DNA sequence: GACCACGGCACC
DNA sequence: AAACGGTGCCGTGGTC
């Protein structure tokens, strides 16, 4: 384009270069804009931010987050990435979008601004006529990007000193386990090397090899195969404990406290909006959507996430979300009655697993039951279900058969979805979000059936993500007016931060908004708790 | 230093 | 590991 003097006119498309992918940590190297056949390159990008009223262009949210970091209210506007992601959720990166819709993603702000303009015009034209996708764009994704920008810039408080001390305790427990392993193996070696561990367990020792690795065909040392040998040898027990502790230490305990931002004093993730095939968000740098919780040690890690002084965390989580969605999508009256009668299928399944009754189930049992219910639903095999549960193969067959028989209309909806998927090439959510699944007609059974599992899972998981996103859109302005903050989303859950004097009203308000986000043939129920830390707020 | 593949595993 | 789905990060082992 023709070079034009900064500032650009309103509504121009922006381009920007960051020193690193994380907006909260990045140095803004260059800033440019393009409109009306002109290009505008900023002489000093930081000062030039003040001239923009809106971040409109590729990766708009990132720039908006960096602006909020600098105290500037620069909301994100149109982003061609959001248009492409709605056209096809395999559009996940600017490189691929440009290579697909006519452009080149470079490292120069001016070119990124010019690309943003062309790509918007092209993708906008491609969506001309996709009424449902346009609705998702205007009413969910585009306003959501603003919500996520505020969440990313706000961050979450972390009890660093607590995690530092925990790192030292866990270290001593790791050393003891390592010593028991070396002594049992008769020599030292790198316990973190699965290749070296393979030799010890299966060659040196005579333990049988349950399974192989996918790509290289090596004897697997995964927990699933080692769990089979939890009695066939004692060193296996200690190795599983060693991995558990090193996993949590190396992934969470040690890195997280080193990511506190100097200006905010809090921990800042990134909520990626075009990263999944089903419409879910993802979290990275660091991923705060997979903080441990299953084990007592993992719960100790959760307690590190705390509220600012004078505030309280509010945790809200949808109940049996994808099962309620399946009720609406399929119409199985039996399944609708379950929820219109207040029954809990996770608890009910936990009863048959552990042979204990209703009131006896604790969270640990119910978690196990939750994996079973969704495992069976989305196509787990009797052989694997026999592996888990530790019941005979026939006993796993009967459970899967009774599971689907309890809700007869579910299996019928699956086939309608696949038929439509085969005919149409894609499956869609309740709101029309699409995922393309061409392999539904592949000639290799394994490939075809794998694609089938992906196909009929997407409308359920995708609808749940749609509902959550829409709830965040509706809830955010209500939180601001009450002086509350939205901190985290974990697919079917939100963590808010509210002043102590308002935490109660915020919790009630957020519960109502999430439950009424979009009435279905089944009621949506939300569980809510308040506490000083993430764990106590969710229990 | 920068990338990357792989096995492995944490979250919903 | 295996006919659950969706993610991202770890250390290892390797290349340039
Ligand atoms: N396929 C699959 N989906 C899963 C799994 N775990 C979770 N999901 C999906 C399906 C779940 O509906 C959704 C939310 O997960 P939660 O909040 O941890 N559990 P829920 O909402 O079911 O029940 P409650 O909140 O009353 O304990 O994530 C899994 O192992 N597999
Ligand atoms: Mg991988
Ligand atoms: Mg899986
Ligand atoms: Mn839930
Ligand atoms: Mn949840």
Short mmCIF file of C-alpha atoms in Angstrom, two decimals, chain A:
data_model
loop_
_atom_site.label_atom_id
_atom_site.label_comp_id
_atom_site.label_asym_id
_atom_site.label_seq_id
_atom_site.Cartn_x
_atom_site.Cartn_y
_atom_site.Cartn_z
CA UNK A 1 0.00 0.00 0.00
CA UNK A 2 0.94 3.69 -0.06
CA UNK A 3 2.71 4.91 3.07
CA UNK A 4 0.57 7.31 5.10
CA UNK A 5 1.39 9.31 8.24
CA UNK A 6 0.41 8.06 11.66
CA UNK A 7 -2.30 8.10 13.03
CA UNK A 8 -4.61 6.02 10.85
CA UNK A 9 -8.32 6.78 10.42
CA UNK A 10 -10.87 5.10 12.64
CA UNK A 11 -11.78 1.55 11.70
CA UNK A 12 -8.36 0.75 10.24
CA UNK A 13 -6.97 -2.78 10.48
CA UNK A 14 -4.01 -3.13 12.84
CA UNK A 15 -0.80 -5.10 12.61
CA UNK A 16 1.74 -5.63 15.35
CA UNK A 17 4.89 -7.59 16.17
CA UNK A 18 5.65 -8.95 19.64
CA UNK A 19 9.00 -9.98 21.08
CA UNK A 20 7.29 -13.16 22.32
CA UNK A 21 3.93 -14.88 22.01
CA UNK A 22 2.73 -13.94 25.51
CA UNK A 23 1.05 -10.49 25.37
CA UNK A 24 1.45 -9.90 29.12
CA UNK A 25 5.23 -10.44 28.81
CA UNK A 26 5.86 -9.11 25.30
CA UNK A 27 7.70 -6.01 24.19
CA UNK A 28 5.67 -4.22 21.51
CA UNK A 29 8.24 -4.00 18.73
CA UNK A 30 6.19 -2.51 15.89
CA UNK A 31 2.67 -1.24 15.28
CA UNK A 32 1.02 -0.51 11.94
CA UNK A 33 -2.41 0.07 10.44
CA UNK A 34 -4.04 -0.08 7.01
CA UNK A 35 -7.20 1.35 5.46
CA UNK A 36 -8.37 2.85 2.17
CA UNK A 37 -5.33 1.70 0.20
CA UNK A 38 -2.97 3.28 2.75
CA UNK A 39 -0.60 1.85 5.34
CA UNK A 40 0.40 3.64 8.55
CA UNK A 41 3.55 2.64 10.44
CA UNK A 42 3.92 4.01 13.96
CA UNK A 43 7.25 5.68 14.82
CA UNK A 44 6.96 4.65 18.50
CA UNK A 45 4.51 1.76 18.97
CA UNK A 46 3.89 2.17 22.71
CA UNK A 47 2.86 5.81 22.36
CA UNK A 48 0.97 4.97 19.15
CA UNK A 49 -1.31 2.59 21.07
CA UNK A 50 -2.98 5.64 22.61
CA UNK A 51 -4.21 6.70 19.15
CA UNK A 52 -6.26 3.55 18.51
CA UNK A 53 -9.85 3.19 19.68
CA UNK A 54 -10.04 -0.53 18.89
CA UNK A 55 -7.79 -3.48 18.03
CA UNK A 56 -9.26 -4.71 14.73
CA UNK A 57 -7.22 -7.35 12.94
CA UNK A 58 -5.41 -10.65 13.23
CA UNK A 59 -4.82 -11.73 16.84
CA UNK A 60 -6.70 -8.66 18.07
CA UNK A 61 -7.10 -10.06 21.59
CA UNK A 62 -3.33 -10.29 22.08
CA UNK A 63 -2.81 -6.59 21.33
CA UNK A 64 -5.79 -5.66 23.51
CA UNK A 65 -4.25 -7.61 26.40
CA UNK A 66 -0.94 -5.80 26.01
CA UNK A 67 -2.83 -2.50 25.95
CA UNK A 68 -4.70 -3.32 29.16
CA UNK A 69 -1.29 -4.16 30.64
CA UNK A 70 -0.30 -0.56 29.85
CA UNK A 71 -3.50 0.86 31.34
CA UNK A 72 -5.17 1.45 27.96
CA UNK A 73 -8.74 0.46 27.18
CA UNK A 74 -8.32 -0.87 23.63
CA UNK A 75 -11.12 -3.40 23.10
CA UNK A 76 -10.59 -6.11 20.48
CA UNK A 77 -12.83 -5.78 17.42
CA UNK A 78 -13.03 -7.87 14.27
CA UNK A 79 -10.37 -10.57 13.97
CA UNK A 80 -10.17 -12.58 10.71
CA UNK A 81 -8.98 -15.54 12.81
CA UNK A 82 -12.44 -15.68 14.39
CA UNK A 83 -14.15 -15.71 10.99
CA UNK A 84 -11.91 -18.51 9.72
CA UNK A 85 -12.25 -20.53 12.93
CA UNK A 86 -16.03 -20.38 12.52
CA UNK A 87 -15.82 -21.39 8.86
CA UNK A 88 -13.56 -24.31 9.83
CA UNK A 89 -12.07 -24.85 13.32
CA UNK A 90 -8.98 -26.35 11.68
CA UNK A 91 -8.13 -22.68 10.99
CA UNK A 92 -6.05 -22.26 14.15
CA UNK A 93 -3.02 -20.16 13.18
CA UNK A 94 -2.43 -17.00 11.14
CA UNK A 95 0.08 -18.90 8.99
CA UNK A 96 -2.54 -21.42 7.89
CA UNK A 97 -5.33 -18.88 7.46
CA UNK A 98 -3.18 -16.68 5.22
CA UNK A 99 -1.89 -19.65 3.22
CA UNK A 100 -5.51 -20.78 2.72
CA UNK A 101 -7.40 -17.53 2.02
CA UNK A 102 -4.84 -15.58 -0.01
CA UNK A 103 -2.00 -13.92 1.86
CA UNK A 104 1.35 -14.21 3.60
CA UNK A 105 1.89 -14.07 7.37
CA UNK A 106 5.24 -12.33 7.86
CA UNK A 107 7.02 -10.65 10.80
CA UNK A 108 6.46 -7.02 9.69
CA UNK A 109 3.66 -5.02 11.31
CA UNK A 110 2.77 -3.16 8.11
CA UNK A 111 2.32 -6.39 6.16
CA UNK A 112 0.33 -7.91 9.03
CA UNK A 113 -1.99 -4.90 8.95
CA UNK A 114 -2.43 -5.13 5.18
CA UNK A 115 -3.00 -8.88 5.48
CA UNK A 116 -5.60 -8.31 8.20
CA UNK A 117 -7.58 -6.07 5.84
CA UNK A 118 -7.53 -8.42 2.84
CA UNK A 119 -8.21 -11.51 4.94
CA UNK A 120 -11.16 -9.81 6.64
CA UNK A 121 -12.70 -8.80 3.31
CA UNK A 122 -12.27 -12.32 1.93
CA UNK A 123 -13.46 -14.27 4.98
CA UNK A 124 -16.35 -11.84 5.49
CA UNK A 125 -17.49 -12.49 1.92
CA UNK A 126 -17.22 -16.25 2.45
CA UNK A 127 -19.54 -15.91 5.46
CA UNK A 128 -22.05 -13.78 3.53
CA UNK A 129 -25.09 -16.06 3.79
CA UNK A 130 -23.99 -18.15 6.79
CA UNK A 131 -26.59 -16.60 9.07
CA UNK A 132 -25.94 -19.00 11.95
CA UNK A 133 -22.16 -18.57 11.82
CA UNK A 134 -22.59 -14.80 11.62
CA UNK A 135 -24.74 -14.98 14.76
CA UNK A 136 -22.01 -16.93 16.56
CA UNK A 137 -19.49 -14.32 15.40
CA UNK A 138 -21.42 -11.21 16.45
CA UNK A 139 -23.07 -12.59 19.59
CA UNK A 140 -20.39 -14.92 21.01
CA UNK A 141 -16.87 -14.95 19.59
CA UNK A 142 -16.27 -11.26 18.90
CA UNK A 143 -17.65 -10.03 22.26
CA UNK A 144 -16.03 -13.01 24.00
CA UNK A 145 -12.60 -11.89 22.78
CA UNK A 146 -13.05 -8.74 24.88
CA UNK A 147 -14.01 -10.81 27.93
CA UNK A 148 -10.94 -13.02 27.51
CA UNK A 149 -8.68 -9.98 27.12
CA UNK A 150 -9.82 -8.71 30.53
CA UNK A 151 -9.39 -12.17 32.10
CA UNK A 152 -5.87 -12.47 30.67
CA UNK A 153 -4.88 -9.00 31.86
CA UNK A 154 -6.35 -9.46 35.34
CA UNK A 155 -4.55 -12.72 36.16
CA UNK A 156 -4.94 -14.72 39.36
CA UNK A 157 -3.17 -14.45 42.71
CA UNK A 158 -0.82 -17.27 43.68
CA UNK A 159 0.61 -18.16 47.10
CA UNK A 160 4.24 -18.35 46.00
CA UNK A 161 5.89 -18.91 49.39
CA UNK A 162 3.48 -21.83 49.88
CA UNK A 163 4.58 -23.45 46.62
CA UNK A 164 8.27 -22.83 47.32
CA UNK A 165 7.97 -24.71 50.61
CA UNK A 166 5.94 -27.44 48.88
CA UNK A 167 8.67 -27.88 46.26
CA UNK A 168 11.11 -28.77 49.05
CA UNK A 169 8.83 -31.31 50.74
CA UNK A 170 7.99 -32.99 47.42
CA UNK A 171 11.70 -33.06 46.59
CA UNK A 172 12.51 -35.11 49.69
CA UNK A 173 9.67 -37.54 48.98
CA UNK A 174 10.94 -37.87 45.40
CA UNK A 175 14.45 -38.69 46.65
CA UNK A 176 13.20 -41.48 48.92
CA UNK A 177 11.18 -43.08 46.12
CA UNK A 178 14.15 -42.79 43.76
CA UNK A 179 16.37 -44.56 46.30
CA UNK A 180 13.89 -47.42 46.66
CA UNK A 181 13.83 -47.74 42.87
CA UNK A 182 17.60 -47.75 42.35
CA UNK A 183 18.04 -50.27 45.16
CA UNK A 184 15.31 -52.55 43.80
CA UNK A 185 16.76 -52.24 40.29
CA UNK A 186 20.24 -52.92 41.67
CA UNK A 187 21.81 -49.88 39.98
CA UNK A 188 21.11 -46.20 39.27
CA UNK A 189 19.72 -44.84 36.01
CA UNK A 190 17.59 -41.98 34.70
CA UNK A 191 14.10 -42.69 36.01
CA UNK A 192 12.82 -39.93 33.70
CA UNK A 193 14.03 -41.80 30.59
CA UNK A 194 11.26 -44.15 29.50
CA UNK A 195 13.81 -45.93 27.29
CA UNK A 196 16.11 -46.72 30.21
CA UNK A 197 13.09 -47.68 32.33
CA UNK A 198 11.93 -50.04 29.57
CA UNK A 199 15.22 -51.95 29.75
CA UNK A 200 15.15 -52.27 33.54
CA UNK A 201 11.55 -53.45 33.87
CA UNK A 202 11.31 -55.77 30.86
CA UNK A 203 14.89 -56.86 30.09
CA UNK A 204 16.87 -56.82 33.34
CA UNK A 205 13.78 -57.70 35.35
CA UNK A 206 11.46 -60.24 33.78
CA UNK A 207 8.23 -58.30 33.94
CA UNK A 208 5.79 -58.90 31.05
CA UNK A 209 5.11 -56.14 28.53
CA UNK A 210 1.39 -55.40 28.36
CA UNK A 211 1.50 -53.12 25.32
CA UNK A 212 3.51 -51.16 22.77
CA UNK A 213 3.94 -47.49 21.93
CA UNK A 214 2.10 -46.08 18.93
CA UNK A 215 4.82 -44.62 16.72
CA UNK A 216 7.99 -46.58 17.58
CA UNK A 217 6.60 -49.93 18.73
CA UNK A 218 8.56 -49.87 21.99
CA UNK A 219 7.43 -51.69 25.11
CA UNK A 220 5.21 -49.16 26.87
CA UNK A 221 5.84 -48.02 30.44
CA UNK A 222 2.58 -46.06 30.74
CA UNK A 223 0.59 -46.08 33.96
CA UNK A 224 -2.09 -48.24 32.33
CA UNK A 225 0.30 -51.14 31.66
CA UNK A 226 2.21 -50.64 34.91
CA UNK A 227 -1.05 -50.65 36.89
CA UNK A 228 -1.47 -54.24 35.69
CA UNK A 229 1.84 -55.03 37.42
CA UNK A 230 0.95 -53.21 40.65
CA UNK A 231 1.37 -56.63 42.32
CA UNK A 232 3.53 -58.51 39.79
CA UNK A 233 6.48 -56.54 41.19
CA UNK A 234 7.06 -53.92 43.92
CA UNK A 235 9.34 -51.52 42.05
CA UNK A 236 6.35 -50.73 39.82
CA UNK A 237 4.45 -49.28 42.79
CA UNK A 238 7.26 -46.87 43.63
CA UNK A 239 7.76 -45.84 40.00
CA UNK A 240 4.13 -44.74 39.75
CA UNK A 241 4.58 -42.66 42.90
CA UNK A 242 7.81 -41.20 41.51
CA UNK A 243 6.10 -40.16 38.28
CA UNK A 244 3.13 -38.69 40.15
CA UNK A 245 5.35 -36.40 42.23
CA UNK A 246 7.77 -35.45 39.44
CA UNK A 247 4.81 -34.77 37.15
CA UNK A 248 3.25 -32.30 39.58
CA UNK A 249 6.58 -30.80 40.67
CA UNK A 250 8.03 -30.25 37.20
CA UNK A 251 4.76 -29.14 35.60
CA UNK A 252 3.09 -27.03 38.30
CA UNK A 253 4.84 -26.58 41.65
CA UNK A 254 8.15 -25.29 40.31
CA UNK A 255 7.23 -23.35 37.13
CA UNK A 256 4.11 -21.51 38.31
CA UNK A 257 5.68 -19.32 41.05
CA UNK A 258 8.35 -18.24 38.54
CA UNK A 259 5.64 -16.80 36.24
CA UNK A 260 4.38 -14.03 38.55
CA UNK A 261 4.30 -10.73 36.68
CA UNK A 262 6.31 -7.90 38.28
CA UNK A 263 3.73 -5.14 37.73
CA UNK A 264 0.57 -7.08 38.62
CA UNK A 265 1.92 -9.55 41.18
CA UNK A 266 -0.40 -12.19 39.70
CA UNK A 267 -0.31 -15.15 37.33
CA UNK A 268 -1.47 -14.57 33.75
CA UNK A 269 -2.57 -17.30 31.36
CA UNK A 270 -3.72 -17.04 27.75
CA UNK A 271 -7.20 -18.19 26.72
CA UNK A 272 -6.79 -19.25 23.09
CA UNK A 273 -9.99 -18.78 21.11
CA UNK A 274 -9.11 -20.65 17.89
CA UNK A 275 -7.26 -23.69 19.22
CA UNK A 276 -9.76 -26.59 19.40
CA UNK A 277 -11.79 -28.54 16.88
CA UNK A 278 -15.00 -28.51 18.97
CA UNK A 279 -15.29 -24.81 19.87
CA UNK A 280 -13.79 -25.13 23.34
CA UNK A 281 -11.25 -22.64 24.58
CA UNK A 282 -7.74 -23.67 25.51
CA UNK A 283 -5.33 -22.23 28.07
CA UNK A 284 -1.55 -21.98 27.77
CA UNK A 285 1.60 -20.21 28.92
CA UNK A 286 0.81 -21.52 31.50
CA UNK A 287 -2.16 -23.85 31.04
CA UNK A 288 -4.46 -23.07 33.98
CA UNK A 289 -7.16 -25.45 32.71
CA UNK A 290 -5.36 -28.58 33.94
CA UNK A 291 -4.20 -27.68 37.45
CA UNK A 292 -4.14 -30.92 39.50
CA UNK A 293 -7.12 -31.79 41.69
CA UNK A 294 -7.54 -35.58 41.69
CA UNK A 295 -5.01 -36.44 44.40
CA UNK A 296 -4.52 -34.99 47.89
CA UNK A 297 -1.22 -33.56 46.66
CA UNK A 298 -2.93 -32.03 43.64
CA UNK A 299 -5.47 -30.42 45.95
CA UNK A 300 -2.59 -28.89 47.90
CA UNK A 301 -1.57 -27.25 44.62
CA UNK A 302 -5.09 -25.91 44.09
CA UNK A 303 -4.95 -24.15 47.47
CA UNK A 304 -2.12 -21.99 46.08
CA UNK A 305 -4.61 -20.14 43.86
CA UNK A 306 -6.06 -17.52 46.21
CA UNK A 307 -8.04 -14.28 46.20
CA UNK A 308 -6.56 -10.83 46.67
CA UNK A 309 -6.79 -9.49 50.21
CA UNK A 310 -10.35 -8.39 50.92
CA UNK A 311 -11.73 -10.62 48.15
CA UNK A 312 -13.12 -14.13 47.80
CA UNK A 313 -13.07 -16.60 44.94
CA UNK A 314 -16.39 -17.79 43.50
CA UNK A 315 -16.29 -21.12 41.65
CA UNK A 316 -19.25 -22.10 39.46
CA UNK A 317 -19.44 -25.41 37.60
CA UNK A 318 -22.19 -26.87 35.43
CA UNK A 319 -23.66 -30.16 36.63
CA UNK A 320 -23.32 -33.17 34.32
CA UNK A 321 -23.19 -30.64 31.54
CA UNK A 322 -22.71 -32.78 28.43
CA UNK A 323 -25.34 -35.27 29.63
CA UNK A 324 -27.92 -32.48 29.87
CA UNK A 325 -26.82 -31.33 26.41
CA UNK A 326 -27.25 -34.87 25.10
CA UNK A 327 -30.77 -34.89 26.53
CA UNK A 328 -31.65 -31.73 24.59
CA UNK A 329 -29.96 -32.84 21.37
CA UNK A 330 -31.36 -36.39 21.36
CA UNK A 331 -34.68 -35.95 23.16
CA UNK A 332 -34.41 -39.20 25.14
CA UNK A 333 -37.34 -38.80 27.53
CA UNK A 334 -35.75 -41.21 30.00
CA UNK A 335 -32.64 -39.03 30.10
CA UNK A 336 -34.68 -35.82 30.42
CA UNK A 337 -36.62 -37.29 33.35
CA UNK A 338 -33.30 -38.05 35.08
CA UNK A 339 -32.59 -34.32 35.23
CA UNK A 340 -36.18 -33.11 35.70
CA UNK A 341 -36.15 -35.52 38.68
CA UNK A 342 -32.81 -34.35 40.08
CA UNK A 343 -30.96 -37.64 39.61
CA UNK A 344 -27.16 -37.76 39.45
CA UNK A 345 -25.75 -40.27 36.98
CA UNK A 346 -22.14 -39.82 38.13
CA UNK A 347 -23.12 -40.73 41.69
CA UNK A 348 -25.38 -43.55 40.50
CA UNK A 349 -22.59 -45.09 38.41
CA UNK A 350 -20.19 -44.73 41.35
CA UNK A 351 -22.57 -46.91 43.38
CA UNK A 352 -22.32 -49.97 41.12
CA UNK A 353 -18.55 -49.51 40.75
CA UNK A 354 -17.73 -49.44 44.47
CA UNK A 355 -20.71 -51.45 45.71
CA UNK A 356 -21.46 -48.62 48.15
CA UNK A 357 -24.64 -46.53 48.42
CA UNK A 358 -25.39 -42.96 47.35
CA UNK A 359 -24.50 -41.17 50.61
CA UNK A 360 -21.21 -43.08 50.90
CA UNK A 361 -19.77 -41.76 47.63
CA UNK A 362 -16.99 -39.24 48.14
CA UNK A 363 -15.47 -37.05 45.39
CA UNK A 364 -12.68 -39.53 44.59
CA UNK A 365 -15.22 -42.26 43.79
CA UNK A 366 -17.45 -39.84 41.86
CA UNK A 367 -14.54 -38.65 39.71
CA UNK A 368 -13.78 -42.24 38.73
CA UNK A 369 -17.46 -42.74 37.89
CA UNK A 370 -17.46 -39.58 35.76
CA UNK A 371 -14.73 -40.91 33.46
CA UNK A 372 -16.64 -44.18 33.10
CA UNK A 373 -19.91 -42.49 32.13
CA UNK A 374 -18.29 -40.35 29.43
CA UNK A 375 -15.94 -43.14 28.39
CA UNK A 376 -18.83 -45.52 27.73
CA UNK A 377 -20.87 -42.77 26.07
CA UNK A 378 -18.28 -41.78 23.46
CA UNK A 379 -17.34 -45.30 22.39
CA UNK A 380 -15.08 -47.03 24.94
CA UNK A 381 -14.63 -50.76 24.39
CA UNK A 382 -15.61 -53.55 26.76
CA UNK A 383 -11.98 -54.71 26.76
CA UNK A 384 -10.75 -51.35 28.04
CA UNK A 385 -13.72 -51.00 30.39
CA UNK A 386 -12.75 -54.45 31.66
CA UNK A 387 -9.22 -53.13 32.22
CA UNK A 388 -10.57 -50.34 34.39
CA UNK A 389 -13.02 -51.49 37.08
CA UNK A 390 -11.01 -54.74 37.33
CA UNK A 391 -14.14 -56.73 36.44
CA UNK A 392 -14.40 -59.65 33.99
CA UNK A 393 -14.80 -58.90 30.30
CA UNK A 394 -18.41 -60.09 30.36
CA UNK A 395 -19.12 -57.76 33.29
CA UNK A 396 -17.94 -54.79 31.21
CA UNK A 397 -20.13 -55.83 28.27
CA UNK A 398 -23.26 -55.91 30.44
CA UNK A 399 -22.60 -52.46 31.92
CA UNK A 400 -22.18 -50.84 28.50
CA UNK A 401 -25.34 -52.57 27.28
CA UNK A 402 -27.43 -51.43 30.26
CA UNK A 403 -25.95 -47.91 30.05
CA UNK A 404 -27.30 -47.27 26.55
CA UNK A 405 -30.48 -49.24 27.29
CA UNK A 406 -31.20 -46.86 30.18
CA UNK A 407 -31.36 -44.08 27.55
CA UNK A 408 -32.56 -45.74 24.33
CA UNK A 409 -32.88 -42.57 22.22
CA UNK A 410 -29.16 -41.77 22.57
CA UNK A 411 -27.97 -44.44 20.13
CA UNK A 412 -30.56 -43.26 17.60
CA UNK A 413 -29.30 -39.67 17.74
CA UNK A 414 -25.72 -40.83 17.15
CA UNK A 415 -26.67 -42.42 13.83
CA UNK A 416 -28.66 -39.40 12.63
CA UNK A 417 -25.62 -37.23 13.38
CA UNK A 418 -23.27 -39.50 11.43
CA UNK A 419 -25.65 -39.88 8.48
CA UNK A 420 -25.94 -36.09 8.30
CA UNK A 421 -22.18 -35.92 8.82
CA UNK A 422 -21.53 -38.30 5.93
CA UNK A 423 -23.98 -36.48 3.65
CA UNK A 424 -22.92 -32.97 4.67
CA UNK A 425 -19.22 -33.54 5.40
CA UNK A 426 -19.53 -31.82 8.79
CA UNK A 427 -21.35 -32.07 12.10
CA UNK A 428 -22.70 -29.05 13.94
CA UNK A 429 -23.60 -27.81 17.41
CA UNK A 430 -26.99 -26.59 18.59
CA UNK A 431 -26.01 -23.09 17.43
CA UNK A 432 -24.51 -24.20 14.10
CA UNK A 433 -20.80 -24.35 14.93
CA UNK A 434 -19.28 -26.74 12.40
CA UNK A 435 -16.53 -29.35 12.49
CA UNK A 436 -15.63 -31.06 9.22
CA UNK A 437 -15.09 -34.82 9.42
CA UNK A 438 -14.35 -36.17 5.92
CA UNK A 439 -13.05 -39.51 7.22
CA UNK A 440 -16.61 -40.68 7.97
CA UNK A 441 -16.44 -42.40 4.57
CA UNK A 442 -12.84 -43.62 4.77
CA UNK A 443 -12.37 -47.20 3.55
CA UNK A 444 -10.25 -48.36 6.52
CA UNK A 445 -12.57 -49.31 9.37
CA UNK A 446 -10.28 -48.16 12.19
CA UNK A 447 -9.88 -44.74 10.56
CA UNK A 448 -13.61 -44.50 9.81
CA UNK A 449 -14.71 -45.49 13.31
CA UNK A 450 -12.20 -43.09 14.89
CA UNK A 451 -13.68 -40.28 12.79
CA UNK A 452 -17.14 -41.42 13.90
CA UNK A 453 -16.21 -41.00 17.56
CA UNK A 454 -14.91 -37.50 16.82
CA UNK A 455 -18.03 -36.69 14.80
CA UNK A 456 -20.80 -37.39 17.30
CA UNK A 457 -18.76 -36.04 20.23
CA UNK A 458 -18.41 -32.58 18.68
CA UNK A 459 -22.10 -31.51 18.89
CA UNK A 460 -22.19 -32.45 22.58
CA UNK A 461 -18.85 -30.98 23.66
CA UNK A 462 -19.29 -28.13 21.17
CA UNK A 463 -22.76 -27.19 22.40
CA UNK A 464 -21.48 -27.19 25.98
CA UNK A 465 -18.70 -24.82 24.90
CA UNK A 466 -21.21 -22.61 23.07
CA UNK A 467 -23.35 -22.39 26.21
CA UNK A 468 -20.36 -21.53 28.40
CA UNK A 469 -19.08 -18.88 25.99
CA UNK A 470 -22.51 -17.26 25.77
CA UNK A 471 -22.78 -17.28 29.57
CA UNK A 472 -19.43 -15.52 29.86
CA UNK A 473 -20.60 -12.91 27.34
CA UNK A 474 -23.79 -12.25 29.32
CA UNK A 475 -22.17 -12.47 32.75
CA UNK A 476 -19.18 -10.17 32.21
CA UNK A 477 -20.99 -6.78 32.18
CA UNK A 478 -22.98 -7.82 35.26
CA UNK A 479 -19.73 -8.58 37.10
CA UNK A 480 -18.14 -5.23 36.22
CA UNK A 481 -21.15 -3.27 37.49
CA UNK A 482 -20.93 -5.22 40.76
CA UNK A 483 -17.16 -4.68 40.97
CA UNK A 484 -16.30 -8.34 40.42
CA UNK A 485 -13.77 -10.04 38.16
CA UNK A 486 -13.80 -13.06 35.86
CA UNK A 487 -10.53 -14.94 36.36
CA UNK A 488 -10.62 -18.41 34.80
CA UNK A 489 -12.72 -20.64 32.58
CA UNK A 490 -12.27 -24.41 32.62
CA UNK A 491 -14.65 -25.53 29.86
CA UNK A 492 -17.75 -25.95 32.06
CA UNK A 493 -16.61 -23.86 35.04
CA UNK A 494 -15.77 -20.27 35.94
CA UNK A 495 -13.70 -18.81 38.77
CA UNK A 496 -14.65 -15.25 39.74
CA UNK A 497 -13.10 -12.81 42.18
CA UNK A 498 -15.40 -10.60 44.23
CA UNK A 499 -14.94 -8.23 47.17
CA UNK A 500 -15.90 -9.92 50.43
CA UNK A 501 -18.92 -7.64 50.93
CA UNK A 502 -20.34 -8.62 47.51
CA UNK A 503 -19.19 -12.24 47.12
CA UNK A 504 -22.60 -13.61 48.12
CA UNK A 505 -24.59 -11.51 45.64
CA UNK A 506 -22.08 -12.23 42.86
CA UNK A 507 -22.38 -15.98 43.43
CA UNK A 508 -26.19 -15.88 43.27
CA UNK A 509 -26.10 -13.66 40.17
CA UNK A 510 -23.53 -15.77 38.31
CA UNK A 511 -25.44 -18.96 39.13
CA UNK A 512 -28.68 -17.56 37.67
CA UNK A 513 -26.97 -16.23 34.53
CA UNK A 514 -25.20 -19.51 33.78
CA UNK A 515 -28.29 -21.63 34.41
CA UNK A 516 -30.53 -19.39 32.29
CA UNK A 517 -27.96 -18.68 29.54
CA UNK A 518 -30.16 -20.54 27.03
CA UNK A 519 -33.18 -22.58 28.22
CA UNK A 520 -33.20 -26.17 26.98
CA UNK A 521 -35.64 -29.06 27.20
CA UNK A 522 -33.69 -29.92 30.37
CA UNK A 523 -32.73 -27.53 33.21
CA UNK A 524 -29.10 -26.49 33.56
CA UNK A 525 -27.96 -26.68 37.18
CA UNK A 526 -24.82 -24.91 38.43
CA UNK A 527 -22.91 -25.75 41.60
CA UNK A 528 -21.38 -22.71 43.30
CA UNK A 529 -19.05 -22.20 46.24
CA UNK A 530 -17.14 -19.36 47.87
CA UNK A 531 -13.74 -19.48 49.53
CA UNK A 532 -10.35 -17.88 49.98
CA UNK A 533 -8.72 -20.44 47.65
CA UNK A 534 -9.67 -22.41 44.55
CA UNK A 535 -10.08 -25.69 46.44
CA UNK A 536 -12.30 -24.44 49.27
CA UNK A 537 -14.43 -22.46 46.80
CA UNK A 538 -15.23 -25.69 44.90
CA UNK A 539 -16.03 -27.78 48.00
#
